[PDB]
């Protein structure tokens, strides 16, 4: 008959990323017979990669870590100072870097075949596709397909970048799924975008001594505080990166071919028809991501998700509509699409499905870092978010900046690294937000989105010591209110 | 001379190409630094003994062996007498490496 | 007002000027009175106390220049062509530190104009009921009036007692400014000054010893200070436990010279010699609150320790005569504290605030090789207060990301929480041995006082990739002894 | 060259043995980068204005003097002729030096 006689499986997960592993390792750790079905189908121009998901082949990992050599860079510079005998200009190597990050990368790809062993998980590099209830179809590379069937089924495909959908993007632009193993040194480079994804980016390439330039629509940072998303734009020009705003390409053409080659962009004004032409090296499209839920036959199955977005509507224990079906990670309806997040999820799940647990996942006042040349932490709700939903006579805003003890002997930056905590009035001036731009701002970060799960207030804020010396002790000492308009800008070295 | 098999196919097939001779596996991985260092020292070292059958295993490349036998750690050695899993140890410790393909010749 | 000024504060550091710009803050006439008694060898500094001339920040400096070092090595992996090794020099060094102290000084007297608050860098000393002797460097005395008064005068470092001490041996007071390259160096000491600088100047390439007497970082949970004794070890600096250095000879005169210590065993004793070029001491410090006159004055102190008892609002015995910082008895002895407790302080007195100074779970930071970060209470500290039987201890090793390339170091880093069962798991002890630990400490003492829990905890989203994300899935108990021990590179 | 001065006395009472040949007053410190930056061109600017008497006041070493000025931060000039303050500039711009001399010879 039609359902069958018994399922293969307890559980089979589609998709083997952040969220889709996190679950597969808890499931079998209460026995369950599971099984993830990972594949990743080829960029534009042919690349591909291993397990683990975007995070850790084209996202988190390799992001961070070109970060973290931009970093050296400076780190390099303000050696001198403090009496490292380092030349005056050090320079950087494009593929023993690109190396050293695959090398990392291929390790952990290969850690997680091992801890799916381990539990006893059976992967499969094949690509999952629903063909009616209980069943699906896995396609290896070869073409050799084969159905499956498990008593439930959880939706963990993730996201894609996206492109333009204009003539020479699909031929000549790059995406970060290129980027991060990309075979020469990029050279001259316009990115396009805004997201964090595209300053983050366009961020390191400035840092190893690249001419970056960005082309932007309209705002940066779209989502996020605003006040800070523009001291980043503002610090991100000052440290030599190159802007375009309001503009947008409608067309790459090749100049030459070449390891790399070079490229011409023509692109329109956002509301005026001006137009301007460029040429560059590398141009890489950071415009956004979209959900795989459309090329898996969900309909077959009964699944609903939103005709527009592709994004999947769940309760908040993540099952869609379908009783078998769950879904997590990015793909999810308004949610956070984070690595962290999607992994909470997945562990959670499989603990009430399995273990008993009643506990769902906290989508509330989420913490985040954005990794530009000036790192920026976050957590709550942004200033314009406060104002909109307390009314902005109960809106207290505390800020001041800062000047890491490490910059004074390098002499640099003074008052740009800044910090500020949004007080609701009339809730005991509880902190609904917070925000910090500088050195190391996720692990200043982390400890204060906890502070907020236990609901801190001004006062118990106030009441708290601080670490000399240390960054992060400003939060502990801030008095100067926007409102008051006090100045905050602290004097330099001479007075 | 070492056979980079490219197929579990390839792989217990060849563990049979080989009589009562013994099969010493390699596996190894690119992004592995003492993996690379020792493998220089198996290639010379396949030669010596032309008599042992030598077996390298890229754990991407097919990474369908490497799933069976179990490995975990980059390099790993495994030793077989005519299909049995005999001999195996972990690591670039290349005279403890030659000292297991005499004791098992 | 048959007053001079409303308040005089005797100290300028941490504490006094921080209680002197908020006195000032609501007009009050106030003035400080600060004067830096030289050294044995005669080094001295400016205005701004312990902690900006001889303390946290020539200290954290040094201690970045060190990680500096490391971070010459580690770009190499990331593709920067570095060359070799890098040399390092010690004068430019404490040039460009001592720079930037000056900077502070200067700071600190215009601050003090601003506000109206009367400097003077004069060694003030009582002599009777709202009464103070003055003593400027040349010599000429001056006595002042004021409503109220207030002892910040912080400590010093302590010597051995033992003969050639005072005379070939430096303290943490003179390192900081020293006039040439240290060399060869014994450490005499464990307190976390003696670990911190044991650790930069082995940082920056020097032969660093450390000698101690029993055990290391008495006063902190004793599993991570092994754990820190244990990785300086393993990165150059040598140990000698049991010992304790008897008198000490100069082989000769220099800059450096070459000095020889005479140390004897602590358990028994065996005594042994060894040479070396610069001997310092760290092994405490003492309260400058008796060559000060208090008695004329009345205010009580601990005959013995020298510290002075205060009441929650800080007042000592004497209604009119406040104290704060490092000479408080049984306080601790931090900056941020000292600071707090003097901006309070004065809101109390001037402003109608009604607000303590809370001493409960303040957060430090030790800046060894591998930083060092606690909030609350200790593990052994835990079971005593609570009983074994309630006391779980969430452990995890974690490898921070920024190492895998240089591949170096896993299974160091180290993260831990103590947590009492009978009150909802909740979190009484932080601790985490790794990169930035103070960054990270911070928050997790804003979430200790709001009561944080186990629950709470785990319901908290980490950030990734970041360190201080592993304290938000710790799932293995000590109680339970799985393994933490992760895998390397190959697996 | 230039008469560095070291006292409030060397100060207030030397204003005087002067005259009228503007003095031009140089505020510095041996720790302000910019303060050393112009340090020579102040220098060796004293070797280009005899009907002008140099002084160059060390902050720290007569940190009376600098408070009795009103000093902010380095290098700060002020000027005086017969102990009036009739000129005053903050930073090491050189060109605005020379030329606040030059307009108040
Ligand atoms: C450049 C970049 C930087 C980022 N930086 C951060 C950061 O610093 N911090 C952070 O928290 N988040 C970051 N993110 C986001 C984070 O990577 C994602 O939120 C997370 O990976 C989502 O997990 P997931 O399990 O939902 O899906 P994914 O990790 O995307 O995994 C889904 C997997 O399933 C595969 N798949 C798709 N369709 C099928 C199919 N039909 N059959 C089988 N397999 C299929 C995919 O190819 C993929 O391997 C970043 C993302 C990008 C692109
Ligand atoms: C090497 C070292 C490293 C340290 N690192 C840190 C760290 O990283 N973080 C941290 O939080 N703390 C650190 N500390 C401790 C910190 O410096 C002290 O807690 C802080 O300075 C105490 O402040 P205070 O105001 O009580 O006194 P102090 O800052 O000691 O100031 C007292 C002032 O009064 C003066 N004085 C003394 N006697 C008289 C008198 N009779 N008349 C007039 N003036 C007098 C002193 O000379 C001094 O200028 C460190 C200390 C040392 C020695």
Redesign the pocket.
């Known amino acids: 008959e039609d359902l069958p006689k018994s399922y293969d499986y307890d559980l089979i997960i589609?998709?083997?990323?952040?969220?889709?592993l996190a679950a597969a390792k808890e499931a079998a750790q209460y026995g369950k017979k599971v099984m993830v079905?990972?594949?990743?189908?080829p960029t534009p121009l042919g690349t591909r990669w291993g397990?683990?998901?975007?995070?850790?082949?084209?996202?988190?990992i390799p992001?961070?870590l070109m970060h973290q050599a931009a970093l050296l860079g400076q780190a390099l510079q303000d050696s001198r100072n403090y009496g490292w005998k380092v030349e005056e200009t050090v320079k950087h190597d494009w593929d023993r870097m690109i190396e050293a990050v695959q090398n990392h990368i291929g390790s952990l790809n290969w850690g997680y075949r091992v801890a799916l062993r381990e539990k006893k998980v059976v992967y499969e590099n094949?690509?999952?596709?629903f063909i009616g209830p209980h069943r699906i179809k896995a396609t290896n590379n070869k073409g050799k397909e084969k159905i499956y069937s498990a008593e439930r089924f959880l939706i963990?495909?993730?996201?894609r970048?996206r492109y333009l959908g204009i003539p020479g993007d699909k031929e000549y632009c790059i995406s970060?799924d290129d980027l991060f193993s990309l075979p020469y040194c990029p050279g001259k480079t316009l990115v396009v975008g805004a997201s964090y994804?595209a300053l983050?980016?366009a961020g390191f390439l400035a840092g190893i001594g690249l001419d970056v330039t960005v082309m932007v629509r309209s705002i940066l940072l779209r989502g996020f505080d605003q006040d800070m998303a523009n001291k980043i734009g503002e610090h991100m020009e000052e440290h030599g990166i190159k802007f375009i705003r309001q503009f947008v390409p409608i067309k790459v053409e090749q100049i030459e071919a070449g390891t790399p080659g070079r490229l011409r962009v023509v692109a329109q004004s956002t509301n005026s028809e001006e137009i301007i032409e460029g040429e560059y090296n590398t141009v890489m499209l950071a415009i956004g991501?979209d959900a795989?839920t459309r090329?898996?036959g969900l309909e077959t199955v009964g699944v609903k998700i939103n005709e527009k977005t592709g994004k999947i509507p769940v309760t908040d224990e993540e099952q869609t509509n379908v009783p078998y079906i769950y879904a997590?990670?990015?793909?999810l309806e308004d949610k956070v699409?984070?690595?962290?997040?999607?992994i909470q999820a997945g562990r959670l799940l499989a603990q009430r499905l399995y273990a008993g647990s009643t506990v769902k996942c906290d989508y509330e006042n989420v913490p985040?870092?954005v990794?530009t040349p000036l790192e920026y932490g976050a957590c709550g709700l942004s200033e314009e978010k406060a104002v909109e939903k307390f009314g902005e006579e109960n809106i207290e805003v505390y800020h001041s900046y800062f000047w890491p003890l490490e910059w004074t002997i390098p002499s640099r930056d003074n008052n740009k690294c800044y910090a500020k905590i949004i007080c609701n009035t009339k809730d005991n001036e509880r902190v609904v937000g917070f925000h910090v731009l500088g050195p190391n701002a996720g692990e200043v970060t982390q400890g204060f989105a906890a502070a907020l799960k236990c609901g801190l207030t001004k006062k118990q804020l106030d009441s708290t010591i601080g670490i000399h010396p240390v960054c992060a002790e400003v939060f502990t000492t801030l008095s100067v209110t926007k409102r008051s308009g006090a100045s905050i800008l602290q004097a330099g070295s001479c007075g | 001379s070492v056979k980079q098999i490219e197929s579990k196919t390839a792989f217990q097939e060849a563990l049979d190409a080989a009589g009562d001779k013994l099969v010493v596996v390699d596996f190894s991985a690119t992004w592995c630094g003492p993996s690379k260092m020792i493998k220089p020292f198996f290639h010379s070292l396949s030669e010596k003994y032309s008599n042992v059958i030598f077996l390298e295993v890229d754990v991407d490349d097919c990474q369908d062996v490497a799933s069976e036998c179990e490995v975990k750690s980059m390099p790993t050695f495994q030793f077989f007498k005519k299909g049995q899993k005999v001999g195996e140890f972990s690591g670039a410790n290349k005279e403890k490496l030659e000292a297991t393909i005499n004791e098992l010749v």
């Open positions: 589609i998709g083997g990323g952040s969220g889709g079905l990972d594949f990743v189908t397990l683990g998901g975007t995070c850790v082949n084209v996202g988190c992001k961070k094949a690509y999952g596709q963990a495909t993730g996201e970048p970060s994804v983050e980016c991501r795989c090329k898996i997590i990670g990015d793909i699409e984070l690595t962290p997040v999607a985040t870092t990794f």
